Amino acid sequence: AEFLAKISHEIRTPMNGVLGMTELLLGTPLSAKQRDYVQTIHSAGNELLTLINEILDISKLESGQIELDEVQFDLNALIEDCLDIFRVKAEQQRIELISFTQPQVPRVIGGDPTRLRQVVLSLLDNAFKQTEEGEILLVVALDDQGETPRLRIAVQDSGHPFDAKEREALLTAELHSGDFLSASKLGSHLGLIIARQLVRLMGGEFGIQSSQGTTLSLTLPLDP
Amino acid sequence: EFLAKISHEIRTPMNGVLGMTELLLGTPLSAKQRDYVQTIHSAGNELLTLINEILDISKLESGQIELDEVQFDLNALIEDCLDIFRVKAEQQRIELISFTQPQVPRVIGGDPTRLRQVVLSLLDNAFKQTEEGEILLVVALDDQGETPRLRIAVQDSGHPFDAKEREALLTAELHSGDFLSASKLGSHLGLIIARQLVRLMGGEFGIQSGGTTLSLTLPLDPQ
Ligand SMILES: [Co+2]
Ligand SMILES: [Co+2]
Ligand SMILES: [Co+2]
Ligand SMILES: [Co+2]
Ligand SMILES: [Co+2]
C-alpha cells in the first residue's frame, strides 16, 4: 500500500520537469506554430500530472498514511460549483444540465469538501461523455432506507447503459498499486474508479442502476 | 521491450508531449530553448520507463505473466541485441565484443521476446556503469550440475556494486517490508525484472562484482 507514496518524488519529479520547462518556454519568443506545440505540452502534461496526483492521493488514503478531512462546509455551494464547471459545455445545445436538491437535506454537512467535489466532478464528467443528446440530472436527496438518514447524491445520464460485467467491475473495484498504472480495456477509466474508492473510504455505498441510461450514486453517512 | 501495457490514460498524454518535443526540435530554437525541449523529451521518456518497470515487477511477482515455448535462432537473437547497442558504443567510444562457444546450439526452445528483454537489460546496465572499458557478452554452455545448461553473461569494467547493492539485486521483492531504496529503483529496476524473468524461465541469476559480471543460467532440452 505504501510503495507509490514512498517513490512519490521519483514519479512527480520528471512530470514537474516537463511542466517547468513548458512555463519557461512560454516565457521565451515563440512563433505561433511553436506556441501551438508548447501550449499542447502544457495542456497534456497538466492532464497527466493531475492524474498522477490523484493516484498518489488515493494511494496514501488506502494505506493508513493520510486521513480524510473533517470540516463543516456548504454542501449546496459545493454542488453549485461543480455544476458551474460543466455549464459552459452545457451551453452547447445537445445537453441540458438539471439539478434537484430535496428541501430537507442540510445546507452544511461535515466531511471532506475537496475530495467530495472530486467524486461529484468525476460522475458529472462521465455523464457528459456518455451523452450525445439529452439531459444530465444531478439529484441530492436524503436516504432513509437505513437506520438513520444517509445523504444521497446521484448523477443520471441518457447514454449507452452499463452492462452487468462493467457494473460488477466498478462496484467491486479496489486497485492496489501497480493496478493504477495498468491497462485494462474493460469498463471504466481511472477517475471513476478513484472516485468510487473515495466513497468507500468516506464510509459510503456506491450504486450503479441501469433502461437507456445509467444512474451512478453515492450514499454517505450523516451525523444526526 | 516491456511485458505490460500502461494505461492509455497515462500513455496518450505522454505521447502528445513527446510528439510536440519532436515537432519543436524541427523548428529554429535558441540554445536555451533546445535545452528546454531536450529536457522535456528526456523527462517524459524517463517517467514512462519508470512506470513501465513498476508495472512489470507487479505483474511478475503476481504470477501474471506466461512465457512462450517456441524454437528460435539463439545466434540471431544474440547478434541483434548487440546490434542495438553498437550505435551507442561508437559514441561512448566503447568496445563491445562477444563470444559464443561453438558447442552452443543454434536453435533452442523458450520465449525469445523475454530472453531478448533480459539480454537487453544486462547490456543496458553495462553501458550505464562503464564510462570506458570493454563490454563482453558470452554465450556458452555450462557443464556443472546434472544436465547441460545455457549460460549468458555480460562483463563490464565499470564502478561495481557494493555488498548491500548486490544483495538487494538478488533478494529484493516488492512485498518484503521495504522493497527497495527510492534511489536505486530508477537506477536498477530493470535488473530486478531480468532476475524475475530468468527465475520464471527456471534459471538462475548471478552477479559477481570486484568491474561486474551479470550472468544467467538457463535449462536446455537434451540432445
Ligand atoms: Co522521496
Ligand atoms: Co500553467
Ligand atoms: Co456496452
Ligand atoms: Co479513454
Ligand atoms: Co525520441
UniProtKB/TrEMBL annotation, chain B:
Residues 5-222 form the Histidine kinase domain. This is histidine kinase. The gene is retS. The chain holds residues 417 to 642 of 942 of the full protein. It comes from Pseudomonas aeruginosa (strain ATCC 15692 / DSM 22644 / CIP 104116 / JCM 14847 / LMG 12228 / 1C / PRS 101 / PAO1).
